Amino acid sequence: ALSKEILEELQLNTKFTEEELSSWYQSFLKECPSGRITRQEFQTIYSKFFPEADPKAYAQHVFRSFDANSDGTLDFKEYVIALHMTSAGKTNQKLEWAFSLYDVDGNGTISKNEVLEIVTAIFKMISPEDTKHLPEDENTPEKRAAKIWGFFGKKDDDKLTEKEFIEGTLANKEILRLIQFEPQKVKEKLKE
């Protein structure tokens, strides 16, 4: 079963009860009997549930951000939190995690190329139809990433720190809009 400690972390990021999480876990074990889900299996979830998208890159990056020990798997806890990160809960409490998403190589700072990589992965989550609710100045990943880097006041070779990333995503709501990683929130912003 689930340790009381894991259950304690799964309510900072979910609102399911202990019994509910345990039932999901039992079902998880039938499909993933090692208690681990691989990157390809995780990607398959996203490919299935985002049919209008090309979600492979996005799902790979989300997976990476949660594979804390880099063993190529997520355990149940990490998988539950990952799904919730992409799909549930309020945005502002996710900003620290978002730093780990954007810091692709895990070296502790974000580079311009890393912003482009993640912006591109998220951009591919936008449907064909919604891709024309895109303003001209924001209609390619290159343009969106360029704007983000500009809002951070950065030169090409500069490194963006965690301190600055959190400040900017809290304070500048245009940075927030552009770095947004939940596909439904990206979609709703494009329409609204």
Nearer to Na ion, 67 or 114 (CB): 67
Contacted by 184, from Ca ion, Na ion, none: CB < 5 to 8 Å by type: none
CB of 29 vs Na ion, minimal distance in Å = 17
Site for Na ion in 68-107 (CB under 5 A): 69, 71, 73
Nearer to Na ion, 77 or 147 (CB): 77
| Polymer length in residues for the chain | 192
Residue 83, token pair as written in the block: 């799904």
Tell me if 86 is assigned to a ligand binding site: no
CB of 103 vs Ca ion, minimal distance in Å = 4
Report yes or no: 79 and 70 within 8 Å, Cβ to Cβ: no
Q: Is the dihedral of CA 45, 125, 65, 1 positive or negative?
A: negative
Report yes or no: 104 and 117 within 8 Å, Cβ to Cβ: yes
- Using CB under 5 A as the binding rule, whether residue 107 contacts Ca ion is answered as yes
Site string for Na ion, 39-68 (x = CB under 5 A): ----------------------------x-
Nearer to Ca ion, 109 or 140 (CB): 109
CB of 102 vs Na ion, minimal distance in Å = 20
Q: Which stretch binds Ca ion (CB under 5 A): 3-11, 32-40, 82-90, 104-112?
A: 104-112
Dihedral Cα 29, 30, 33, 36, nearest 10 deg:
-50
Residue 95, token pair as written in the block: 């900003």
DSSP string, 127-179: -TTGGGSS-GGGSSHHHHHHHHHHHTT--TT--B-HHHHHHHHHH-HHHHHHH
Strands 73-75 and 36-38, bridge-based pairing: antiparallel
In the complex, which residues of this chain contact Na ion (CB under 5 A)?
Answer: 67, 69, 71, 73
Feature table: binding site for Ca(2+): 67, 69, 71, 73, 78, 103, 105, 107, 109, 114
In the complex, which residues of this chain contact Ca ion (CB under 5 A)?
Answer: 103, 105, 107
